[PDB]
A paper describes a structure:
5-Nitrosalicylate dioxygenase (EC 1.13.11.64; 5NSDO), isolated from the soil bacterium Bradyrhizobium sp. JS329, is an enzyme involved in the degradation of 5-nitroanthranilic acid, which is produced biologically for an unknown purpose by Streptomyces scabies and also industrially in the synthesis of nitroaromatic products and dyes. The degradation pathway is initiated by hydrolytic removal of the amino group catalyzed by an aminohydrolase to form 5-nitrosalicylate, which is then oxidized by 5NSDO, which cleaves the aromatic ring with the production of 4-nitro-6-oxohepta-2,4-dienedioic acid. 5NSDO is a nonheme iron(II)- and oxygen-dependent enzyme that belongs to the third class of ring-cleaving dioxygenases as it cleaves the aromatic ring of 5-nitrosalicylate, an ortho-hydroxy-substituted carboxylic acid. The enzyme also catalyzes the oxidation of 5-chlorosalicylate, while it is not active towards gentisate, salicylate, 5-hydroxyanthranilate, 4-nitrocatechol or 4-chlorocatechol.
The crystal structure of 5NSDO from Bradyrhizobium sp. was determined at 2.1 Å resolution by the molecular-replacement technique using a theoretical model predicted by AlphaFold. The asymmetric unit contains one tetramer. Each subunit of 5NSDO folds as a monocupin domain (residues 81–152) which consists of eight β-strands organized into two four-stranded antiparallel β-sheets that are a characteristic feature of this superfamily (β-barrel). The tetramer is mainly stabilized by the long flexible N-terminal region of each subunit, which makes interactions with all three of the other subunits. The quaternary structure is arranged in such a way that the active metal sites are oriented towards the external edge of the tetramer. Comparing the 5NSDO structure with those of closely related ring-cleaving dioxygenases of the same class, for example SDO and GDO, we found that the active-site residues are poorly conserved, as expected from the unusual activity exhibited by the enzyme, which accepts 5-chloro­salicylate and 5-nitrosalicylate as substrates but not gentisate and salicylate. Specifically, the residues which interact with the 5-OH group of gentisate (Asp174 and Trp104) are missing in 5NSDO, explaining the lack of activity of 5NSDO towards gentisate. Arg127, which is supposed to facilitate the deprotonation of the substrate in SDO, is substituted by Tyr104 in 5NSDO, likely due to the lower pK a of the substrate hydroxyl group compared with salicylate. Unfortunately, in all four 5NSDO subunits electron density for the side chain of Tyr58 was absent, so it was not included in the model.
Author numbering:
A (entry chain A), B (entry chain C): 0 to 179
C (entry chain B): 0 to 181
D (entry chain D): 0 to 182
């Protein structure tokens, strides 16, 4: 965890006036978000211009900036929901990993196989599949079209509570409590 | 909600790199918090030095500034928990209200009556009581010693989702969606 | 809220053994879920065989039964996510309503108009759109192909907390605190 | 994690009618809870009738049974908050552990030391202290009176999401994903 000192007391543990609490707690409203697939597809195909790019790092996140706290730019698609899209070229692999964040996958394009906890399934467009919290899961695109997926995850909720664990690549030595 | 416009597009609706998302979603760890009762009671007595202050506003938030997100000083006592303390003098009342946020009460000191949806209970030190989401509740402090309450609630969670409602004072025409 | 008595005290307010909390707090793990679009679409068609069906009631919930608490059937697609699909025939409307639950809409097929808080967008397939909590929103399907939507929402989370509100149809008198008996 | 088979398809993956869904998500309302400290203390003191009782297991949970899904006996104090109380005799210890659930401690009675990630703090009645998610923490009661603490936590939130981790005793080999099965 951390090397810290309480020998100067606890300056961070404070007591504030209800007006400051209330002023910080109430949020602006968020305008509706709209995103177009062409732009998502443009974004992701742009990722291939980077030499340092591979299949495991080829996600964009779909965000509504109004959703942020205070005046800050948010990263949720709504306040409590998070969403990303991913491109996998045929023949690419996303190797086994796990995280206690769950993921919800919707196949927009492409075919392939998904492996979770030793079992393979062969996917096709508009399949829906989940990778349960802390389940080992891996991808391989097949066929002649890129796999593009629309993904809902709660990684961010757990990050904010500081309860996110990730293990990539596979192997106990790779487990991390996900904090800066 | 809002008068708004899409006539110029949805500039707030965006698509971002996985590295930006990751960087904004991982949080700093949080040093343990410690608060002293004396400081809480002192904070509360201070408020009385406001002439324009009454029983319904006599609350302080207990915060651990580390639990903030990104650069924000936090207002939770932990990331996902929120705590307040409140002081009612004998013969004061917090009149009927409701909010969709729940509240959990620990009576540290004092006695009196809690009314929730038409039923009255007489509390004493170290009683524990809940005011269910959206239930009409009211307080009347009795005896000679001030009522001091230690309060756990989820008001901030609903506030962040923009899903929080507040009816004060009693009367459906007083309901507000709590944003702005 | 409710008429209730405490005259008999608080029998439901208990104190339980650590063993009992733990036996009840720890869940079974959950097998991964897999749904095929064809099962969804078939499901949505069946609903038209009902004469007492219209645009507004025409949704199915995609569920993972393993996700239940204790030994019960779950209602989530994951423990904390909720997923629905809806079908609107062209020329149908979903009338203006609001709820403090949020909705994330993916257009799989169809075209039409989304109205949110007085602003209209014309959607096409694979567009993504949100209806923020408690915003007035309305649907009208256009063109020739049915609109089919993949929808994620937090309604169940708010319901479990008993902090969910729903106003349908539009009008403050239609507001309900969504608990068994409204 | 899981020895499972998809060789017989995925029968748990269902599609249900809105009517069945709505019928299942909407819950009964919850009566207010009230609990009295005398009864809590009596509970905790009772537990010491068990001879194989120690400081690590001297907790009871404070529950509002109306809070459960369906007509089920729930275990939250509210739907989304969970509350326990614990008794530590002076000279007893809760040894180092960590869990990704947070804990919020209110000292009702007693005195002692709280250690979190190498730092000690000496506690007294009506002190408020947190043990952040995944921080090593340990207790030792001092003085001539039992430590009684009023504790709020989100262990159950995490348990339900199947995202709860627990390491007791200290040491990585003892980390568990907390699901029925894995310790
Ligand atoms: Fe993954
Ligand atoms: Fe209140
Ligand atoms: Fe709606
Ligand atoms: Fe602990």
């Amino acid at each position: 965890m951390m090397k810290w000192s309480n020998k100067d007391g606890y300056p961070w543990s404070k007591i504030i006036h209800a007006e400051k609490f209330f002023d910080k707690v109430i949020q602006n409203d968020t305008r509706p978000g709209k995103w177009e697939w062409a732009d998502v597809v443009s974004g992701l195909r742009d990722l291939d211009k980077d030499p340092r790019m591979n299949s495991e790092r080829r996600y964009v996140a779909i965000v509504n900036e109004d959703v942020g706290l205070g005046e800050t730019k948010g990263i949720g698609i709504t306040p409590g929901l998070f969403c990303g899209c991913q491109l996998i070229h045929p023949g690419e692999e996303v190797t086994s990993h796990r995280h206690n964040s769950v993921a919800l996958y919707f196949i927009v394009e492409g075919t392939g196989e998904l492996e979770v906890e030793g079992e393979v399934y062969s996917y096709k467009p508009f399949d829906i599949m989940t990778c349960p919290a802390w389940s080992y899961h891996a991808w391989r695109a097949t066929g002649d079209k890129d796999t593009l997926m629309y993904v809902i995850h709660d990684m961010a909720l757990l990050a904010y509570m500081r309860a996110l664990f990730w293990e990539e690549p596979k192997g106990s030595e790779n487990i991390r409590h996900m904090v800066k």
